[PDB]
Write a protein that binds this ligand. Sequence first.
Ligand code: XB2
Lengths: 100, 50, 50, 149, 148
Amino acid sequence: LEGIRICRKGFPNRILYGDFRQRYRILNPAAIPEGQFIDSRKGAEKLLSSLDIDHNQYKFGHTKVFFKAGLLGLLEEMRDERLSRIITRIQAQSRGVLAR
Amino acid sequence: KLTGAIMHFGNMKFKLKQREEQAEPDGTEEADKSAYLMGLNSADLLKGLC
Amino acid sequence: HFGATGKLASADIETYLLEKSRVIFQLKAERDYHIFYQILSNKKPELLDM
Amino acid sequence: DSEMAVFGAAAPYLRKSEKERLEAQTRPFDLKKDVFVPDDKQEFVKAKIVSREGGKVTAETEYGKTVTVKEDQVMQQNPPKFDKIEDMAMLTFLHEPAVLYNLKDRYGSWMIYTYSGLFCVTVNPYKWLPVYTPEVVAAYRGKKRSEAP
Amino acid sequence: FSKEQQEDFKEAFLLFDRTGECKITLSQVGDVLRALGTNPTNAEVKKVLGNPSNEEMNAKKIEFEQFLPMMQAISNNKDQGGYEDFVEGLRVFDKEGNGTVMGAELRHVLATLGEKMKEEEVEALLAGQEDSNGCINYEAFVKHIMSV
Ligand SMILES: CC(C)n1c(=O)cc(N[C@@H](C)c2ccccc2)[nH]c1=O
């Protein structure tokens, strides 16, 4: 019961700004344009603001981003949906030029 | 770029944890500037260094 | 343990505290370790000879 | 659920049947009146509010026994739409009887595993479910906690 | 498209039609529109057809005048992925991070996990593109397949 009390109220999910950028950049490459420098903190700020999810679910730490109980699962669902979308669309390209 | 990174690499600031005597970056802006130049990642660079 | 490619590469077993006294003392409604009764129950002639 | 077919014969022993889904929307339940009350032989029992008397309340329990307890010790029942949820962190009202009865309604139907947010609770079946043979392992490959039961 | 665009689109069907003038390939035509225009997911082709039968896919041949609108409709599905969108894809298969993808798991991924592909094409697309260590410079593979 106490563990649920903290999971519901607190911020059980947490990502380093670098591993967050590395892993979920596939979620919105335009929010974090590469080829140009952008600090880890403001990058994560722009990407998560771009996700259009409920902004009351997260707060930012000195070195890790912090999420409410139910967000991280939704982010992994989102990422695997995108990886499916993309591997099928790269296959769209692979078949398109192979057919060319 | 490598000369520049060796310049930035001295600007990375590290702070000791309150009890583990382990280095964590406060000056993350200098570490991600360095990694951006050397083509590493800020997190795995900092994790490897510390 | 898994490799960089993610395939199984090894496994390590670690043990912390075997109830070594159970080998010699048990309360009512409980057994000693299973090895002894499982060996005895089949009366496997090769093991019952060894 | 048509997607349950991937577990074969193990499927009835992991997730509730389609009838339990339809029954949930038809259960008689009142959020303001249905509450749990403590009992002697069993920690909590369902009860029905019958009246209001300011700071003192009186209610009739499911076994027809009369009870009087102050409002500080009465906990509202969870609505039937959240009964047997797979993760107890998703319960709406969280208290000692909500977890007790959430485990009891699942375990009485041999659905032995249930999550509790960052951790999971497993209740000893004592009788086997064909939930441990090779075929289920393939169903669990790469599936996430949101997908697999 | 220009009126001179539809003519050169037409003669693709005119070479692929083995009939003297009543064929266009219901099973193979969408596959060719990738070359003349942009490339969709096959499921979107099936959705514009309205989910036909597999036996239809093997036996049916469709009429070209109804297909001219289909050319535009199949061209219509925008939000195709860009270069960075594609190059971050195969990095999740890259369990090293250096810029190489082993072909033993690359062909596995391309064959088993996404939409179906004719496997001989998967054999011959990477053939000659491998290195001596048995990997692929996927940022080159993507800048290969986006360009030509
Ligand atoms: C606090 C803990 C539960 N946690 C996380 O909350 C997230 C982690 N890593 C990220 C990068 C990740 C998210 C989801 C699946 C895999 C990895 N690590 C973690 O250690």
